[PDB]
Amino acid sequence: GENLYFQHMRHFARTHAIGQIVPGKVTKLVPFGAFVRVEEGIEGLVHISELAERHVEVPDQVVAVGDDAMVKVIDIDLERRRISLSLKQANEDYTEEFDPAKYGMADSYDEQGNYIFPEGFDAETNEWLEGFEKQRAEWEARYAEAERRHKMHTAQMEK
């Protein structure tokens, strides 16, 4: 969405890990890359060197205005309100095996990379607790979205 708010870009940085792969929409082509809108108020440049493995002379060879793409967040500059994205790197990091950390579940893994069981799920008995039905639904909606994004990425690799 066209206007930009420090507060929204900040909220994006804090809820998105570097390395996360996100759905975007190609909005504009220029000679040195493609602009890709990831979210309301969050548009990044995919540099022309970050579009594909093969050598590219113009971005039109790889994408067009209106294409949907799964792109990797490679850096966020809050001060200059710029996000850097890469299509090529998202595709390098792709794996048939689903890694939820890449697709929106990064904060289900602690700093050593161990899975953190969600609030309301009991690890020992491996069940959801009575009374945590709403947290269960919010977690399942999250996993579901993360899994849909990886399925979109599999579709992208299949092209």
UniProtKB/Swiss-Prot annotation:
Changing F35G: 3-fold decrease in binding of POA, decreased binding of tmRNA (expressed as residues 285-481). GO terms for cellular component: cytosol; cytosolic small ribosomal subunit; peptidoglycan-based cell wall; plasma membrane. Keywords: Repeat, Ribonucleoprotein, Ribosomal protein, RNA-binding. It comes from the Bacteria. The keyword Amino-acid biosynthesis does not apply. Changing K28A: 2.5-fold decrease in binding of POA, decreased binding of tmRNA (expressed as residues 285-481). One of its GO terms (molecular function) is mRNA binding. GO terms for biological process: translation. Residues 19-88 form the S1 motif domain. Changing F32A: 2.5-fold decrease in binding of POA, decreased binding of tmRNA (expressed as residues 285-481). Changing R82A: 2.7-fold decrease in binding of POA, decreased binding of tmRNA (expressed as residues 285-481). The keyword Ribosomal protein applies. Full-length S1 protein and the C-terminal domain (residues 285-481) bind tmRNA; the interaction is disrupted in a concentration-dependent manner by POA. 2 POA molecules bind to the C-terminal domain (residues 285-481) and S1 motif 4 (residues 285-368). Mutations in this gene that alter POA binding may cause antibiotic resistance. Binds mRNA, facilitating recognition of most mRNAs by the 30S ribosomal subunit during translation initiation. Probably plays a role in trans-translation; binds tmRNA (the product of the ssrA gene). In trans-translation Ala-aminoacylated transfer-messenger RNA (tmRNA, product of the ssrA gene; the 2 termini fold to resemble tRNA(Ala) while it encodes a short internal open reading frame (the tag peptide)) acts like a tRNA, entering the A-site of the ribosome and displacing the stalled mRNA (which is subsequently degraded). Belongs to the bacterial ribosomal protein bS1 family. This is Small ribosomal subunit protein bS1. It comes from Mycobacterium tuberculosis (strain ATCC 25618 / H37Rv). The lineage of its organism: Bacteria, Bacillati, Actinomycetota, Actinomycetes, Mycobacteriales. The gene is rpsA. The chain holds residues 285 to 434 of 481 of the full protein.
